[PDB]
Write a protein that binds this ligand. Structure first.
Ligand code: NI
Length: 350
């Protein structure tokens, strides 16, 4: 772009699992029926610490999706990594979110954005059904003009898959799918792609290599929650990734708070302090000179990691956190500033 340049190397983690009565005949993923002790239910008493400018919205409302794409466009975010479960599983307490992918791709395309996939730890996820599911994703969505591909050092452009909780499956199983020799190898097929493992522990570095993964990411917004999410380890991981031609993708967040659904977890709470926590993380990511940067999150409201517009709100039961004294778009604007800084700086790397 020009006065709105889209950073194609900036990815944001995006969730399509919210529902309300209007569009889904019910409230879905806005509170948690884990607190009977209800007079604590939407649209007023959502479980999230912050309150969305769009209300207790529906991910399938196309005006919502539009708005989301406008907001991501204003942050200069080129790519959303969409949370994905397969359409053939038990997991989702609702209608399968794979149903929305085609709309999300269309709306994404209006605004010149791209969609990549963030594969959730669905039930019995293993190498075998991952093969089926990777095929499904590429067959169904791979030719859509908004489908994301990343250009390798070669020039060869590939689909990307962030695999959340990748450590759950053993390296010998990953290797069946992700090494050339593997019995179910996607290598050199039209199903090939760049698979990015979620690194939690230092130990995982070596497992990840062994497995045949093409990159690593860190996910968690709380600096210090894991070895991977701790900024002080990022230089070291970057070094390791460069040594072995892995794509290092640090994940930066604006803060963290989930005490609504986990009252005991105040240790992992990180106050936003008017954007400074965000800027500290962004800064530490840029310092590694990374090939990509990921943002946790566009709209993970339950973990309090969202950059999506939030508004002040008080009810009889709840006073929500908010972005005062700044505007609901504070994090979109901070993201734009740091995106531009990242475009400029990246153009100078090897
Ligand atoms: Ni313009």
């Amino acid at each position: 772009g020009r006065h709105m340049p889209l950073n194609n190397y900036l990815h944001v983690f995006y969730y399509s699992w919210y529902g309300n009565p209007q569009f889904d005949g019910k409230y879905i993923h806005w509170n948690h029926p884990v607190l009977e002790h209800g007079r604590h239910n939407p649209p007023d008493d959502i479980g999230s610490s912050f309150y969305p400018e769009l209300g207790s919205y529906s991910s399938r409302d196309p005006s919502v999706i539009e708005t989301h794409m406008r907001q991501m466009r204003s942050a200069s975010i080129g790519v959303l990594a969409l949370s994905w479960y397969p359409p053939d599983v038990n997991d989702e307490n609702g209608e399968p979110t794979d149903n929305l992918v085609p709309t999300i791709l269309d709306k994404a395309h209006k605004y010149n954005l791209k969609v990549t996939f963030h594969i959730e730890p669905y039930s019995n996820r293993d190498d075998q059904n991952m093969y089926k599911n990777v095929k499904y994703i590429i067959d169904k969505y791979g030719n859509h003009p908004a489908f994301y591909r990343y250009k390798t050092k070669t020039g060869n452009a590939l689909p990307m898959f962030y695999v959340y909780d990748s450590y759950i499956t053993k390296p010998e199983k990953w290797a069946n799918l992700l090494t050339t020799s593997g019995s179910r190898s996607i290598r050199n097929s039209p199903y090939d792609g760049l698979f990015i493992a979620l690194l939690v522990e230092e130990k995982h570095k070596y497992d990840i290599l062994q497995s045949g993964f093409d990159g690593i990411y860190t996910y968690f917004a709380t600096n210090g929650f894991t070895y991977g999410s701790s900024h002080q380890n990022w230089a070291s991981l970057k070094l390791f990734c460069d040594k072995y031609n892995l794509i290092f993708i640090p994940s930066v967040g604006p803060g963290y708070i989930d005490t609504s659904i986990r009252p005991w977890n105040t240790q992992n709470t990180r106050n936003r302090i008017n954007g400074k926590y965000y800027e500290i993380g962004l800064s530490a990511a840029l310092q590694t000179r990374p090939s990509l940067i990921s943002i946790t999150s566009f709209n993970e409201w339950h973990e309090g990691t969202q950059i999506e517009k939030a508004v002040p709100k008080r009810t009889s039961n709840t006073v929500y956190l908010d972005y005062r004294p700044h505007k609901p778009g504070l994090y979109l604007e901070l993201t734009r500033k740091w995106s531009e800084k990242y475009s400029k700086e990246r153009a100078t790397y090897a």
